[PDB]
Amino acid sequence: YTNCKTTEDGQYIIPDEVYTIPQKESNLEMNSEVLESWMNYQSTTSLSIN
Amino acid sequence: YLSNRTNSRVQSFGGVPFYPGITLETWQKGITNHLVAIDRAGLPLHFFIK
Ligand SMILES: *[C@@H]1O[C@H](CO)[C@@H](O)[C@H](O)[C@H]1NC(C)=O
């Protein structure tokens, strides 16, 4: 770290045997969904006789 | 039978480390440094050996 370097956008101190070339970003979100619902019903009889 | 399906994919190079809730602005204003070579052109190095 003799002639102690620093990255161009100075926010680090690289050692003087390395050089940097700055770039990036990347991300990706994704999601899914699934629902359901069911029902039913009834029946009836009746007879009143005589 | 409900089914959402969401995707998302940012791919930035290069500004401030991206994050979903970021405005389309604070990205820009934060580009002061964080510049990146988006395009480049040069010569074959044998040309420079003269
Ligand atoms: C997701 O499903 C909900 C119902 O739960 C629906 O209102 C909405 O439009 C769907 N899409 C998004 C992006 O929320």
XYZ file of all heavy atoms in Angstrom, unseen atoms left out:
810
model
N 0.824 -1.197 0.000
C 0.000 0.000 0.000
C 0.860 1.249 0.000
O 0.495 2.257 0.610
C -0.942 0.017 1.195
C -2.006 -1.041 1.146
C -1.774 -2.301 1.652
C -3.242 -0.778 0.603
C -2.739 -3.267 1.612
C -4.211 -1.739 0.561
C -3.952 -2.980 1.067
O -4.916 -3.948 1.030
N 2.017 1.193 -0.653
C 2.998 2.259 -0.536
C 2.464 3.586 -1.050
O 2.196 4.498 -0.264
C 4.261 1.881 -1.299
O 3.930 1.656 -2.672
C 4.855 0.616 -0.728
N 2.276 3.697 -2.360
C 1.777 4.930 -2.951
C 0.264 4.910 -2.895
O -0.391 5.057 -3.928
C 2.237 5.061 -4.394
C 2.243 3.739 -5.106
O 1.281 2.990 -5.033
N 3.325 3.444 -5.809
N -0.290 4.756 -1.698
C -1.539 4.024 -1.554
C -2.618 4.572 -2.470
O -2.946 5.760 -2.447
C -2.000 3.999 -0.099
S -3.135 5.233 0.452
N -3.125 3.689 -3.316
C -4.078 4.020 -4.358
C -5.432 4.280 -3.730
O -5.581 4.347 -2.510
C -4.175 2.882 -5.363
C -3.335 3.024 -6.591
C -3.678 1.912 -7.553
C -2.905 2.039 -8.839
N -3.405 1.090 -9.864
N -6.437 4.429 -4.577
C -7.828 4.476 -4.175
C -8.649 4.416 -5.444
O -8.204 4.864 -6.499
C -8.155 5.737 -3.370
O -9.553 5.768 -3.080
C -7.776 6.975 -4.130
N -9.828 3.823 -5.346
C -10.685 3.744 -6.513
C -11.051 5.144 -6.976
O -11.026 6.100 -6.203
C -11.931 2.953 -6.189
O -12.828 3.782 -5.445
C -11.557 1.782 -5.349
N -11.377 5.262 -8.259
C -11.618 6.576 -8.839
C -12.721 7.306 -8.092
O -12.508 8.393 -7.551
C -11.952 6.430 -10.313
C -10.735 6.242 -11.173
C -10.157 4.857 -11.066
O -10.717 4.031 -10.318
O -9.142 4.592 -11.739
N -13.904 6.712 -8.023
C -14.962 7.259 -7.182
C -14.551 6.950 -5.753
O -15.000 5.982 -5.137
C -16.301 6.637 -7.525
C -16.244 5.133 -7.531
O -15.326 4.589 -8.170
O -17.105 4.498 -6.892
N -13.664 7.785 -5.226
C -12.927 7.362 -4.061
C -13.825 7.009 -2.907
O -14.323 7.877 -2.191
N -14.044 5.711 -2.735
C -14.638 5.193 -1.519
C -14.041 3.844 -1.160
O -14.704 3.023 -0.525
C -16.150 5.102 -1.636
C -16.638 4.301 -2.800
C -18.139 4.182 -2.787
O -18.822 4.959 -2.122
N -18.668 3.204 -3.513
N -12.798 3.600 -1.561
C -12.066 2.414 -1.148
C -10.583 2.705 -1.272
O -10.181 3.737 -1.808
C -12.439 1.202 -1.986
C -13.787 0.636 -1.677
C -14.810 0.720 -2.587
C -14.037 0.025 -0.475
C -16.031 0.206 -2.311
C -15.258 -0.491 -0.194
C -16.248 -0.396 -1.114
O -17.473 -0.915 -0.838
N -9.768 1.787 -0.773
C -8.315 1.888 -0.873
C -7.825 0.560 -1.436
O -7.523 -0.372 -0.690
C -7.651 2.183 0.468
C -8.190 3.468 1.056
C -6.178 2.311 0.291
C -7.690 3.704 2.429
N -7.726 0.470 -2.748
C -7.211 -0.749 -3.348
C -5.724 -0.813 -3.046
O -5.097 0.227 -2.821
C -7.483 -0.780 -4.852
C -6.815 0.408 -5.517
C -8.951 -0.703 -5.110
C -7.068 0.480 -6.982
N -5.122 -1.990 -3.003
C -3.671 -2.063 -2.927
C -3.074 -1.753 -4.280
O -3.674 -2.008 -5.321
C -3.420 -3.512 -2.530
C -4.531 -4.225 -3.138
C -5.721 -3.324 -3.007
N -1.864 -1.230 -4.264
C -1.297 -0.658 -5.471
C -0.815 -1.699 -6.451
O -0.058 -1.369 -7.365
C -0.168 0.299 -5.109
C 0.711 -0.240 -4.022
O 0.444 -1.366 -3.560
O 1.654 0.466 -3.609
N -1.223 -2.950 -6.296
C -0.994 -3.953 -7.318
C -2.281 -4.380 -7.997
O -2.300 -5.409 -8.672
C -0.293 -5.170 -6.725
C 0.640 -4.839 -5.595
C 1.670 -3.812 -5.985
O 2.165 -3.868 -7.127
O 1.987 -2.944 -5.149
N -3.365 -3.635 -7.820
C -4.624 -3.957 -8.473
C -5.236 -2.679 -9.013
O -4.986 -1.583 -8.510
C -5.612 -4.655 -7.524
C -4.997 -5.886 -6.932
C -6.059 -3.719 -6.453
N -6.046 -2.826 -10.050
C -6.793 -1.724 -10.619
C -8.227 -2.172 -10.809
O -8.489 -3.347 -11.060
C -6.216 -1.279 -11.949
C -6.317 -2.348 -12.989
C -7.315 -2.331 -13.937
C -5.420 -3.385 -13.010
C -7.404 -3.311 -14.871
C -5.506 -4.363 -13.937
C -6.495 -4.324 -14.864
O -6.568 -5.324 -15.789
N -9.153 -1.232 -10.694
C -10.570 -1.537 -10.735
C -11.215 -0.879 -11.941
O -10.730 0.124 -12.462
C -11.269 -1.048 -9.478
O -11.173 0.376 -9.423
C -10.611 -1.624 -8.263
N -12.334 -1.450 -12.363
C -13.130 -0.920 -13.464
C -14.604 -1.053 -13.102
O -15.158 -2.155 -13.130
C -12.771 -1.621 -14.777
C -12.646 -3.109 -14.536
C -11.471 -1.105 -15.315
C -12.507 -3.908 -15.759
N -15.266 0.030 -12.777
C -16.503 -0.052 -12.001
C -17.771 -0.137 -12.824
O -17.928 0.640 -13.768
C -16.468 1.252 -11.209
C -15.688 2.201 -12.100
C -14.966 1.413 -13.152
N -18.676 -1.061 -12.479
C -20.013 -1.113 -13.066
C -20.861 -2.176 -12.398
O -20.300 -3.203 -12.013
C -19.911 -1.429 -14.555
C -19.692 -2.910 -14.908
C -18.403 -3.505 -14.377
O -17.718 -2.917 -13.556
N -18.066 -4.688 -14.860
N -22.159 -1.921 -12.146
C -23.223 -2.931 -12.274
C -24.556 -2.487 -11.712
O -24.641 -1.401 -11.143
C -22.904 -4.242 -11.584
N -25.589 -3.309 -11.931
C -26.697 -3.634 -11.023
C -27.640 -4.559 -11.770
O -27.729 -4.502 -12.996
C -27.476 -2.419 -10.524
C -26.836 -1.668 -9.396
C -27.184 -0.204 -9.433
O -28.228 0.142 -10.019
O -26.374 0.608 -8.944
N -28.363 -5.395 -11.028
C -29.358 -6.251 -11.661
C -30.176 -6.948 -10.597
O -29.619 -7.467 -9.634
C -28.705 -7.301 -12.564
O -29.607 -8.360 -12.813
N -31.492 -6.984 -10.782
C -32.327 -7.791 -9.907
C -33.610 -8.131 -10.639
O -33.911 -7.568 -11.691
C -32.595 -7.091 -8.570
C -33.623 -5.987 -8.641
O -34.393 -5.879 -9.576
N -33.632 -5.149 -7.617
N -34.374 -9.052 -10.063
C -35.623 -9.457 -10.687
C -36.544 -10.073 -9.651
O -36.143 -10.974 -8.915
C -35.362 -10.429 -11.836
C -34.678 -11.763 -11.567
C -35.701 -12.863 -11.372
C -33.745 -12.100 -12.710
N -37.768 -9.570 -9.593
C -38.806 -10.088 -8.724
C -39.813 -10.851 -9.561
O -40.008 -10.551 -10.739
C -39.522 -8.962 -7.985
C -38.637 -8.127 -7.114
C -39.122 -6.709 -7.010
O -39.136 -6.006 -8.039
O -39.509 -6.300 -5.901
N -40.461 -11.830 -8.944
C -41.508 -12.575 -9.621
C -42.251 -13.403 -8.593
O -41.645 -13.940 -7.668
C -40.943 -13.476 -10.717
C -39.894 -14.429 -10.236
S -40.588 -16.053 -9.897
C -40.867 -16.646 -11.559
N -43.564 -13.502 -8.764
C -44.383 -14.290 -7.859
C -45.624 -14.765 -8.599
O -45.898 -14.344 -9.723
C -44.758 -13.487 -6.619
C -45.811 -12.468 -6.901
O -45.887 -11.938 -8.000
N -46.640 -12.183 -5.911
N -46.385 -15.644 -7.952
C -47.561 -16.235 -8.565
C -48.648 -16.367 -7.510
O -48.462 -15.996 -6.351
C -47.227 -17.583 -9.201
O -46.877 -18.530 -8.214
N -49.788 -16.914 -7.920
C -50.980 -16.942 -7.088
C -51.902 -18.047 -7.575
O -51.918 -18.371 -8.762
C -51.711 -15.605 -7.143
C -51.182 -14.581 -6.211
C -51.838 -14.687 -4.884
O -52.714 -15.558 -4.745
O -51.491 -13.901 -3.984
N -52.684 -18.605 -6.653
C -53.657 -19.651 -6.961
C -54.728 -19.641 -5.877
O -54.407 -19.638 -4.686
C -53.004 -21.046 -7.047
C -54.052 -22.126 -6.898
C -52.263 -21.246 -8.356
N -55.999 -19.654 -6.278
C -57.116 -19.726 -5.345
C -58.128 -20.764 -5.812
O -58.022 -21.309 -6.911
C -57.819 -18.379 -5.193
C -57.083 -17.237 -4.502
C -58.065 -16.156 -4.114
C -56.382 -17.728 -3.282
N -59.123 -21.016 -4.962
C -60.225 -21.925 -5.255
C -61.384 -21.607 -4.317
O -61.233 -20.863 -3.349
C -59.817 -23.390 -5.089
C -59.062 -23.996 -6.251
C -58.863 -25.489 -6.097
O -59.649 -26.123 -5.363
O -57.919 -26.033 -6.709
N -62.552 -22.178 -4.618
C -63.690 -22.181 -3.704
C -64.780 -23.066 -4.293
O -64.999 -23.043 -5.504
C -64.231 -20.765 -3.462
O -65.269 -20.763 -2.502
N -65.459 -23.835 -3.439
C -66.515 -24.752 -3.854
C -67.727 -24.591 -2.942
O -67.649 -23.963 -1.887
C -66.039 -26.208 -3.816
C -65.084 -26.586 -4.893
C -64.229 -25.767 -5.554
C -64.874 -27.897 -5.423
N -63.503 -26.477 -6.474
C -63.879 -27.791 -6.411
C -65.429 -29.149 -5.159
C -63.429 -28.886 -7.137
C -64.982 -30.235 -5.879
C -63.992 -30.098 -6.857
N -68.854 -25.193 -3.340
C -70.085 -25.174 -2.549
C -70.930 -26.405 -2.889
O -70.544 -27.232 -3.717
C -70.888 -23.892 -2.796
C -70.241 -22.595 -2.339
S -69.993 -22.485 -0.563
C -71.585 -21.865 -0.044
N -72.092 -26.521 -2.235
C -73.107 -27.534 -2.534
C -74.425 -27.159 -1.862
O -74.574 -26.070 -1.302
C -72.677 -28.939 -2.111
C -71.909 -29.661 -3.186
O -72.288 -29.636 -4.351
N -70.824 -30.305 -2.804
N -75.386 -28.084 -1.923
C -76.764 -27.830 -1.500
C -77.479 -29.162 -1.258
O -76.848 -30.223 -1.200
C -77.493 -26.963 -2.530
N -78.814 -29.106 -1.145
C -79.595 -30.142 -0.469
C -80.811 -30.679 -1.220
O -81.025 -30.360 -2.393
C -80.076 -29.597 0.870
C -80.769 -28.258 0.768
C -82.256 -28.394 0.570
O -82.805 -29.490 0.637
N -82.922 -27.274 0.330
N -81.632 -31.477 -0.527
C -82.814 -32.125 -1.087
C -83.808 -32.394 0.037
O -83.429 -32.404 1.208
C -82.453 -33.434 -1.792
O -82.011 -34.403 -0.861
N -85.076 -32.617 -0.322
C -86.161 -32.707 0.649
C -87.367 -33.440 0.065
O -87.699 -33.285 -1.113
C -86.582 -31.304 1.111
O -85.532 -30.720 1.892
C -87.869 -31.337 1.917
N -88.028 -34.240 0.906
C -89.309 -34.847 0.562
C -90.241 -34.768 1.762
O -89.802 -34.565 2.896
C -89.169 -36.308 0.122
O -90.439 -36.788 -0.332
C -88.728 -37.166 1.276
N -91.539 -34.932 1.499
C -92.546 -34.889 2.560
C -93.878 -35.362 2.005
O -94.244 -34.989 0.887
C -92.683 -33.483 3.123
O -93.346 -32.642 2.200
N -94.609 -36.160 2.784
C -95.933 -36.648 2.405
C -96.794 -36.732 3.657
O -96.380 -37.321 4.659
C -95.829 -37.995 1.692
C -95.207 -39.199 2.400
C -96.257 -40.009 3.139
C -94.461 -40.066 1.405
N -97.985 -36.128 3.609
C -98.888 -36.026 4.762
C -100.266 -36.517 4.329
O -101.034 -35.772 3.720
C -98.933 -34.598 5.275
O -99.749 -33.800 4.438
N -100.583 -37.773 4.650
C -101.703 -38.447 3.998
C -102.565 -39.240 4.978
O -102.054 -40.093 5.711
C -101.184 -39.376 2.876
C -100.449 -40.596 3.439
C -100.211 -38.645 1.973
C -100.331 -41.751 2.480
N -103.840 -38.862 5.113
C -104.964 -39.802 5.151
C -106.210 -39.052 5.611
O -106.152 -37.872 5.970
C -104.740 -41.033 6.024
C -105.499 -42.243 5.515
O -106.569 -42.114 4.921
N -104.942 -43.428 5.734
N -61.431 -19.692 -9.546
C -60.041 -20.123 -9.685
C -59.218 -18.906 -10.111
O -59.110 -18.601 -11.298
C -59.947 -21.265 -10.682
C -58.565 -21.578 -11.191
C -57.625 -22.189 -10.375
C -58.208 -21.295 -12.499
C -56.362 -22.492 -10.844
C -56.949 -21.592 -12.977
C -56.030 -22.192 -12.146
O -54.774 -22.489 -12.624
N -58.640 -18.229 -9.128
C -57.871 -17.011 -9.341
C -56.388 -17.336 -9.384
O -55.912 -18.178 -8.621
C -58.150 -16.009 -8.226
C -57.179 -14.850 -8.065
C -57.163 -14.015 -9.316
C -57.583 -14.004 -6.890
N -55.655 -16.671 -10.276
C -54.217 -16.909 -10.368
C -53.536 -15.658 -10.915
O -53.530 -15.436 -12.126
C -53.922 -18.119 -11.238
O -53.984 -17.773 -12.605
N -52.955 -14.863 -10.023
C -52.034 -13.817 -10.426
C -50.693 -14.421 -10.797
O -50.337 -15.508 -10.342
C -51.802 -12.824 -9.300
C -52.972 -11.943 -9.051
O -54.037 -12.115 -9.632
N -52.782 -10.977 -8.173
N -49.930 -13.687 -11.597
C -48.548 -14.050 -11.890
C -47.823 -12.767 -12.253
O -48.082 -12.194 -13.311
C -48.459 -15.066 -13.019
C -48.638 -16.496 -12.578
C -48.345 -17.469 -13.689
N -46.918 -17.565 -13.953
C -46.303 -16.933 -14.944
N -46.997 -16.160 -15.765
N -44.998 -17.078 -15.117
N -46.926 -12.321 -11.386
C -46.205 -11.075 -11.579
C -44.737 -11.365 -11.833
O -44.152 -12.244 -11.198
C -46.338 -10.176 -10.353
O -47.721 -9.968 -10.060
C -45.677 -8.846 -10.594
N -44.148 -10.636 -12.768
C -42.709 -10.629 -12.945
C -42.193 -9.216 -12.763
O -42.960 -8.262 -12.633
C -42.296 -11.146 -14.316
C -42.581 -12.603 -14.478
O -42.868 -13.295 -13.508
N -42.497 -13.090 -15.705
N -40.877 -9.098 -12.752
C -40.211 -7.810 -12.664
C -38.735 -8.036 -12.898
O -38.189 -9.041 -12.445
C -40.442 -7.160 -11.307
O -39.760 -5.926 -11.233
N -38.080 -7.135 -13.609
C -36.658 -7.310 -13.862
C -36.056 -5.954 -14.169
O -36.218 -5.454 -15.280
C -36.426 -8.278 -15.010
C -34.992 -8.308 -15.472
C -34.718 -9.493 -16.367
N -35.580 -9.493 -17.540
C -36.639 -10.281 -17.681
N -36.966 -11.128 -16.714
N -37.371 -10.220 -18.783
N -35.381 -5.359 -13.213
C -34.605 -4.173 -13.521
C -33.232 -4.674 -13.899
O -32.815 -5.761 -13.494
C -34.509 -3.173 -12.358
C -35.876 -2.746 -11.912
C -33.701 -3.715 -11.256
N -32.531 -3.904 -14.711
C -31.169 -4.258 -15.078
C -30.463 -2.946 -15.376
O -30.555 -2.436 -16.490
C -31.153 -5.195 -16.270
C -29.784 -5.502 -16.787
C -29.826 -6.374 -18.015
O -28.792 -6.779 -18.537
N -31.029 -6.673 -18.484
N -29.769 -2.409 -14.384
C -29.193 -1.082 -14.489
C -27.685 -1.183 -14.449
O -27.136 -1.953 -13.662
C -29.665 -0.189 -13.358
O -29.344 -0.771 -12.117
N -27.023 -0.404 -15.293
C -25.581 -0.247 -15.188
C -25.221 1.069 -15.843
O -25.382 1.221 -17.052
C -24.830 -1.404 -15.826
C -25.380 -1.851 -17.136
C -24.761 -1.490 -18.308
C -26.479 -2.673 -17.195
C -25.248 -1.916 -19.511
C -26.969 -3.097 -18.390
C -26.355 -2.721 -19.552
N -24.756 2.013 -15.043
C -24.640 1.795 -13.619
C -24.903 3.071 -12.875
O -24.414 4.111 -13.250
N -25.703 3.004 -11.828
C -25.972 4.188 -11.050
C -25.816 3.916 -9.576
O -24.789 3.393 -9.144
N -26.824 4.260 -8.788
C -26.816 3.932 -7.370
C -27.400 2.532 -7.270
O -28.257 2.180 -8.088
C -27.604 4.970 -6.558
C -29.066 4.904 -6.890
C -27.390 4.778 -5.079
N -26.925 1.679 -6.361
C -27.499 0.338 -6.236
C -29.010 0.346 -6.228
O -29.631 0.899 -5.319
C -26.932 -0.140 -4.905
C -25.604 0.473 -4.863
C -25.688 1.795 -5.580
N -29.602 -0.266 -7.245
C -31.035 -0.186 -7.446
C -31.788 -0.897 -6.331
O -31.265 -1.780 -5.650
C -31.417 -0.795 -8.786
C -32.737 -0.340 -9.285
C -32.839 0.775 -10.076
C -33.880 -1.025 -8.959
C -34.055 1.195 -10.532
C -35.094 -0.603 -9.405
C -35.184 0.503 -10.197
N -33.038 -0.491 -6.146
C -33.948 -1.154 -5.228
C -35.361 -0.821 -5.661
O -35.595 0.269 -6.186
C -33.708 -0.714 -3.784
C -33.690 0.767 -3.600
C -34.819 1.438 -3.200
C -32.545 1.495 -3.818
C -34.810 2.787 -3.023
C -32.527 2.846 -3.641
C -33.660 3.487 -3.246
O -33.649 4.845 -3.070
N -36.320 -1.723 -5.455
C -37.625 -1.562 -6.116
C -38.309 -0.241 -5.835
O -38.755 0.434 -6.770
C -38.428 -2.740 -5.565
C -37.419 -3.722 -5.169
C -36.272 -2.944 -4.645
N -38.403 0.156 -4.580
C -39.150 1.356 -4.283
C -38.523 2.646 -4.754
O -39.043 3.715 -4.428
N -37.424 2.587 -5.506
C -36.722 3.803 -5.884
C -37.544 4.564 -6.906
O -38.233 3.971 -7.746
C -35.324 3.477 -6.429
C -34.441 4.710 -6.406
C -35.397 2.997 -7.846
C -33.022 4.412 -6.757
N -37.508 5.885 -6.817
C -38.136 6.691 -7.840
C -37.351 6.583 -9.133
O -36.219 6.107 -9.170
C -38.206 8.149 -7.417
O -36.878 8.627 -7.192
C -39.008 8.293 -6.151
N -37.962 7.040 -10.206
C -37.232 7.179 -11.450
C -36.324 8.390 -11.433
O -35.636 8.645 -12.421
C -38.214 7.280 -12.610
C -39.235 6.142 -12.652
C -40.484 6.564 -13.414
C -38.650 4.867 -13.236
N -36.318 9.133 -10.330
C -35.565 10.368 -10.183
C -34.334 10.195 -9.309
O -33.213 10.399 -9.775
C -36.451 11.444 -9.571
C -35.697 12.674 -9.190
C -36.565 13.653 -8.457
O -37.753 13.342 -8.244
O -36.069 14.730 -8.077
N -34.524 9.829 -8.040
C -33.387 9.658 -7.145
C -32.331 8.753 -7.742
O -31.160 8.851 -7.370
C -33.836 9.097 -5.807
O -34.479 7.840 -6.019
C -34.799 10.038 -5.145
N -32.725 7.863 -8.646
C -31.764 7.234 -9.537
C -30.909 8.277 -10.232
O -29.681 8.279 -10.108
C -32.503 6.395 -10.566
C -31.688 6.077 -11.739
C -31.684 6.731 -12.926
C -30.776 5.005 -11.868
N -30.808 6.139 -13.791
C -30.239 5.069 -13.162
C -30.356 3.995 -11.018
C -29.308 4.174 -13.617
C -29.435 3.110 -11.470
C -28.917 3.199 -12.757
N -31.550 9.183 -10.965
C -30.814 10.144 -11.773
C -29.951 11.048 -10.916
O -28.736 11.113 -11.099
C -31.783 10.973 -12.596
C -32.604 10.149 -13.508
C -31.777 9.567 -14.591
O -32.154 8.587 -15.218
N -30.641 10.181 -14.853
N -30.559 11.762 -9.976
C -29.783 12.691 -9.168
C -28.590 12.011 -8.519
O -27.579 12.665 -8.250
C -30.672 13.331 -8.111
C -31.660 14.309 -8.686
C -32.327 15.099 -7.593
C -33.151 16.229 -8.164
N -33.800 17.016 -7.085
N -28.673 10.709 -8.281
C -27.576 9.989 -7.674
C -26.612 9.393 -8.677
O -25.958 8.393 -8.393
N -26.505 10.000 -9.848
C -25.612 9.517 -10.880
C -24.324 10.339 -10.929
O -23.564 10.232 -11.884
C -26.311 9.496 -12.246
C -25.666 8.508 -13.186
C -26.276 10.854 -12.909
C -26.339 8.512 -14.497
N -24.046 11.131 -9.891
C -22.986 12.131 -9.971
C -21.662 11.493 -10.350
O -21.163 11.731 -11.449
C -22.846 12.881 -8.652
O -23.977 13.740 -8.475
C -21.587 13.726 -8.659
N -21.089 10.687 -9.476
C -20.215 9.613 -9.914
C -21.092 8.369 -10.020
O -22.316 8.486 -10.063
C -19.001 9.483 -8.998
C -19.360 9.578 -7.561
O -20.519 9.767 -7.221
N -18.371 9.449 -6.693
N -20.494 7.185 -10.079
C -21.173 5.968 -10.525
C -21.454 6.048 -12.016
O -22.543 5.718 -12.464
C -22.478 5.664 -9.781
C -22.441 5.956 -8.318
N -23.052 7.061 -7.772
C -21.879 5.289 -7.288
C -22.873 7.059 -6.465
N -22.158 5.996 -6.146
N -20.491 6.522 -12.786
C -20.614 6.444 -14.228
C -19.976 5.158 -14.719
O -19.138 4.560 -14.049
C -19.964 7.646 -14.894
C -20.739 8.934 -14.677
C -20.102 10.059 -15.429
C -22.148 8.744 -15.142
N -20.392 4.725 -15.897
C -19.970 3.437 -16.419
C -19.811 3.566 -17.917
O -20.597 4.247 -18.575
C -20.986 2.337 -16.068
C -20.757 1.111 -16.912
C -20.896 1.984 -14.618
N -18.799 2.912 -18.460
C -18.573 2.953 -19.895
C -19.711 2.215 -20.571
O -19.760 0.987 -20.558
C -17.233 2.324 -20.241
N -20.645 2.962 -21.160
C -21.763 2.326 -21.845
C -21.455 2.019 -23.294
O -22.217 1.292 -23.937
C -23.036 3.187 -21.820
C -22.943 4.281 -22.868
C -23.229 3.812 -20.474
C -24.232 4.996 -23.062
N -20.364 2.551 -23.824
C -20.016 2.338 -25.216
C -18.556 2.698 -25.387
O -18.081 3.657 -24.781
C -20.886 3.186 -26.138
C -20.352 3.240 -27.543
O -19.693 2.269 -27.967
O -20.588 4.256 -28.227
N -17.853 1.941 -26.221
C -16.420 2.141 -26.333
C -15.948 1.763 -27.722
O -16.574 0.964 -28.421
C -15.666 1.332 -25.282
C -15.722 -0.143 -25.506
C -15.428 -0.864 -24.224
N -16.646 -1.178 -23.496
C -16.714 -1.249 -22.176
N -15.636 -1.021 -21.448
N -17.862 -1.544 -21.587
N -14.823 2.353 -28.112
C -14.224 2.096 -29.407
C -12.731 2.334 -29.303
O -12.291 3.260 -28.618
C -14.826 2.986 -30.491
N -11.960 1.497 -29.982
C -10.523 1.602 -29.931
C -9.901 1.046 -31.190
O -10.558 0.914 -32.223
N -8.625 0.718 -31.091
C -7.847 0.241 -32.216
C -7.146 -1.057 -31.856
O -6.982 -1.375 -30.674
C -6.812 1.293 -32.627
C -7.454 2.609 -33.029
C -6.400 3.625 -33.385
C -8.382 2.371 -34.191
N -6.731 -1.841 -32.846
C -5.939 -3.030 -32.542
C -4.579 -2.619 -32.020
O -3.953 -1.700 -32.545
C -5.828 -3.744 -33.893
C -6.857 -3.110 -34.752
C -6.973 -1.710 -34.286
N -4.121 -3.306 -30.975
C -2.950 -2.819 -30.259
C -1.700 -2.860 -31.119
O -0.781 -2.064 -30.900
C -2.732 -3.613 -28.977
C -2.138 -5.006 -29.082
C -1.637 -5.428 -27.724
C -3.170 -5.979 -29.583
N -1.643 -3.759 -32.101
C -0.502 -3.763 -33.008
C -0.323 -2.407 -33.666
O 0.796 -2.030 -34.027
C -0.671 -4.847 -34.064
C -1.451 -4.408 -35.259
N -2.777 -4.727 -35.437
C -1.091 -3.673 -36.338
C -3.205 -4.204 -36.572
N -2.199 -3.559 -37.138
N -1.413 -1.662 -33.826
C -1.334 -0.318 -34.375
C -0.525 0.606 -33.478
O 0.100 1.550 -33.965
C -2.752 0.213 -34.581
C -2.824 1.629 -35.040
C -3.016 1.919 -36.371
C -2.753 2.672 -34.136
C -3.101 3.216 -36.797
C -2.833 3.968 -34.557
C -3.010 4.242 -35.889
N -0.528 0.360 -32.176
C 0.155 1.237 -31.240
C 1.615 0.883 -31.054
O 2.310 1.573 -30.307
C -0.543 1.208 -29.888
C -1.721 2.109 -29.812
C -2.810 1.901 -30.623
C -1.736 3.176 -28.947
C -3.895 2.730 -30.567
C -2.823 4.003 -28.887
C -3.901 3.782 -29.696
N 2.092 -0.173 -31.696
C 3.491 -0.571 -31.612
C 4.169 0.015 -32.843
O 4.282 -0.625 -33.886
C 3.644 -2.083 -31.532
C 2.703 -2.642 -30.473
C 5.071 -2.442 -31.210
C 2.781 -4.127 -30.327
N 4.630 1.252 -32.712
C 5.257 1.985 -33.795
C 6.426 2.778 -33.239
O 6.394 3.200 -32.076
C 4.258 2.926 -34.485
C 3.166 2.208 -35.253
C 3.747 1.357 -36.367
C 4.455 2.217 -37.403
N 5.034 1.412 -38.517
C -53.783 -10.024 -7.788
O -54.944 -10.634 -7.270
C -55.824 -9.680 -6.666
C -56.898 -10.462 -5.951
O -56.372 -11.108 -4.801
C -56.358 -8.746 -7.742
O -57.208 -7.778 -7.138
C -55.198 -8.050 -8.440
O -55.674 -7.304 -9.552
C -54.164 -9.068 -8.921
N -52.988 -8.395 -9.453
C -52.184 -7.605 -8.730
C -51.024 -7.011 -9.463
O -52.381 -7.376 -7.540
